[PDB]
Amino acid sequence: NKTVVVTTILESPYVMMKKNHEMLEGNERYEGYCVDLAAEIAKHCGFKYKLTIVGDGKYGARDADTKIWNGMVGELVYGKADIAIAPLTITLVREEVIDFSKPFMSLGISIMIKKGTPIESAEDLSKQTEIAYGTLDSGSTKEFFRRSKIAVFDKMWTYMRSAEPSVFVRTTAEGVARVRKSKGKYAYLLESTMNEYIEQRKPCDTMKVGGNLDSKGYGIATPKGSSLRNAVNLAVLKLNEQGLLDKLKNKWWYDKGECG
Amino acid sequence: NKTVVVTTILESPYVMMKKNHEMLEGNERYEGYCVDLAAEIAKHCGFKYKLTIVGDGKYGARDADTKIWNGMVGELVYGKADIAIAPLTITLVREEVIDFSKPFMSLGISIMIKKGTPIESAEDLSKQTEIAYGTLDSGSTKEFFRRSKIAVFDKMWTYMRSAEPSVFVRTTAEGVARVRKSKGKYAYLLESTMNEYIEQRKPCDTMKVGGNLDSKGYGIATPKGSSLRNAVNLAVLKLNEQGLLDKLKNKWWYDKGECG
Numbered sequence: 001n002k003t004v005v006v007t008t009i010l011e012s013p014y015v016m017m018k019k020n021h022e023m024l025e026g027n028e029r030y031e032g033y034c035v036d037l038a039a040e041i042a043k044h045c046g047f048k049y050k051l052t053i054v055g056d057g058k059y060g061a062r063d064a065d066t067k068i069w070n071g072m073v074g075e076l077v078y079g080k081a082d083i084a085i086a087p088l089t090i091t092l093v094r095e096e097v098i099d100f101s102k103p104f105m106s107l108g109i110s111i112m113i114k115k116g117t118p119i120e121s122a123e124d125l126s127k128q129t130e131i132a133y134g135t136l137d138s139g140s141t142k143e144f145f146r147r148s149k150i151a152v153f154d155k156m157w158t159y160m161r162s163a164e165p166s167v168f169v170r171t172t173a174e175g176v177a178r179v180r181k182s183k184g185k186y187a188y189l190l191e192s193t194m195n196e197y198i199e200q201r202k203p204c205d206t207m208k209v210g211g212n213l214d215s216k217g218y219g220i221a222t223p224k225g226s227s228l229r230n231a232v233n234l235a236v237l238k239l240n241e242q243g244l245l246d247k248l249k250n251k252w253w254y255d256k257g258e259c260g
Numbered sequence: 261n262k263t264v265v266v267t268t269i270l271e272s273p274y275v276m277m278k279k280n281h282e283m284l285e286g287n288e289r290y291e292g293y294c295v296d297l298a299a300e301i302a303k304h305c306g307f308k309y310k311l312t313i314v315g316d317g318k319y320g321a322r323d324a325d326t327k328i329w330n331g332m333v334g335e336l337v338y339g340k341a342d343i344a345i346a347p348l349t350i351t352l353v354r355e356e357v358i359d360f361s362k363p364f365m366s367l368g369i370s371i372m373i374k375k376g377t378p379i380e381s382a383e384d385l386s387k388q389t390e391i392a393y394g395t396l397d398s399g400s401t402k403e404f405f406r407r408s409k410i411a412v413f414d415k416m417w418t419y420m421r422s423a424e425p426s427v428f429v430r431t432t433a434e435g436v437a438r439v440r441k442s443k444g445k446y447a448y449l450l451e452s453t454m455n456e457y458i459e460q461r462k463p464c465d466t467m468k469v470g471g472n473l474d475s476k477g478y479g480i481a482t483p484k485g486s487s488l489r490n491a492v493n494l495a496v497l498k499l500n501e502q503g504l505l506d507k508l509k510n511k512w513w514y515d516k517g518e519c520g
């Protein structure tokens with residue numbers, strides 16, 4: 001009976017360093033939605049666990065040439081971690097190599113603008129050129145655009161892939177900062193969950209505009225053949241039914257919201 | 261190989277009799293979201309299939325005394341069907357006896373009123389007696405209320421379980437017809453998907469009021485040990501990623517709107 005290695009990612013408000021982390025040990029160093037969720041998954045499934053921050057800071061993409069998976073998906077695939085409890089999007093390319101639980105949170109790709117940017121939709125972005133637009137450089141949002149068979153998203157991808165300087169960002173923080181600094185001339189494509197979060201953070205200068213471009217979810221991911229698979233999945237279901245997932249989202253998004 | 265027996269339920273706009281169904285045969289008798297979904301899933305998984313409407317007309321619940329499952333769940337449990345492709349809610353008690361794919365559609369419990377009924381929320385319903393309210397029998401909505409420890413919803417359950425005459429209905433159509441014919445004196449608790457469909461149908465005399473009471477999904481269900489499980493699961497993800505699930509939702513909800 002071993003300590004389960006949990007891979008996760010420093011992404012607010014899912015996992016954050018506590019103020020006093022240097023004075024704390026192990027799992028107590030971290031706080032956030034996924035920290036709370038990991039404690040509950042572990043309790044319901046009856047395992048001890050160790051939170052680990054993904055080494056490369058990435059979510060998980062497979063390199064076209066080397067076929068190597070990076071990020072948290074890589075850590076699962078290569079057996080460096082036993083479970084990923086993180087804002088990790090359920091995707092087909094990932095579900096082909098790892099198992100996901102039923103989604104614990106819903107999201108879709110969305111548009112973040114600096115307040116007062118004349119953009120209402122993904123159509124509005126594709127039709128103009130004054131406002132630059134991009135995504136996280138190594139995640140499911142980028143892959144949505146790259147793998148699309150849909151005309152308008154193919155159009156947006158074609159712009160983004162060739163845009164100079166690069167419209168892609170290394171971290172959500174960088175995307176958000178870029179929106180805040182580009183005086184309305186950069187829009188960021190990111191998941192609605194992160195968009196919603198940032199809209200409630202000081203200095204309250206960004207907002208989600210328009211509908212989501214897709215509808216999907218984050219799931220808890222395990223390597224194929226994990227003994228944790230069934231129990232993790234039932235735990236997610238139990239926690240949803242008991243209202244905990246809604247409670248945790250409110251706790252980390254809205255209850256401490258800085259924008260009124 | 262073998263023709264896959266698909267259990268489903270006559271529920272608008274998921275599976276409906278075509279207007280000229282009397283002159284049609286087999287699968288061709290039916291149209292709707294789940295009819296289109298079945299066709300797509302069968303195509304991506306490489307099986308032939310026969311749509312069969314669930315004999316007892318129910319979704320599925322377990323008798324507390326006999327432990328026997330009825331409805332589509334029962335048909336899977338007892339080997340009468342190979343797969344359920346229907347607006348079947350993923351729930352813990354079900355996921356313990358059958359497997360669910362990733363959700364193909366999101367929904368939450370909601371309130372339908374006859375237009376002008378002075379009810380805005382579940383709280384409003386709980387605080388009065390003049391307007392009766394109920395749910396579908398042998399479904400997940402009833403179970404939600406049965407199990408809820410939320411004071412508003414427990415108060416509601418306490419009332420509904422004892423209410424005379426019975427506030428529960430056999431079919432969604434019966435719930436909706438009850439709302440329409442009770443002059444505002446009956447409200448109906450049903451899933452947001454069905455509520456929102458009905459709101460856009462003639463005679464446009466109902467509406468959804470308040471927020472959803474929960475957030476969950478419909479899943480394609482297979483009996484435990486099914487050779488279809490993984491392929492069906494991936495097929496749902498492929499269909500979502502292609503935008504096909506979104507296309508089907510628009511086809512059956514909003515393009516089929518009669519209320520403007």
Ligand SMILES: CC(C)S(=O)(=O)NC[C@H](C)c1ccc(-c2ccc(CCNS(C)(=O)=O)cc2)cc1
Pocket residue numbers: 090091102103104105106107215216217218236237240245350362363364365366367475476477478496497500
């Ligand atoms: C990759 C996709 C195919 S998807 O699998 O993400 N679904 C796509 C479809 C559009 C969709 C259906 C339902 C949800 C949803 C997510 C989380 C919750 C909270 C609890 N989730 S739960 C217990 O599983 O119902 C409820 C609902 C999300 C998406």
Ligand SMILES: N[C@@H](CCC(=O)O)C(=O)O
Pocket residue numbers: 059060087088089090136138139140141142189190191
């Ligand atoms: N949740 C995403 C990362 C964020 C994004 O791509 O926008 C993923 O799992 O790749």
Ligand SMILES: N[C@@H](CCC(=O)O)C(=O)O
Pocket residue numbers: 319320347348349350396398399400401402449450451
């Ligand atoms: N979708 C529900 C039926 C409708 C309801 O209970 O409101 C089920 O699977 O039981």
Ligand SMILES: [Zn+2]
Pocket residue numbers: 017021
């Ligand atoms: Zn620090």
Ligand SMILES: [Zn+2]
Pocket residue numbers: 040043044
């Ligand atoms: Zn718990």
Ligand SMILES: [Zn+2]
Pocket residue numbers: 300303304504
């Ligand atoms: Zn297809």
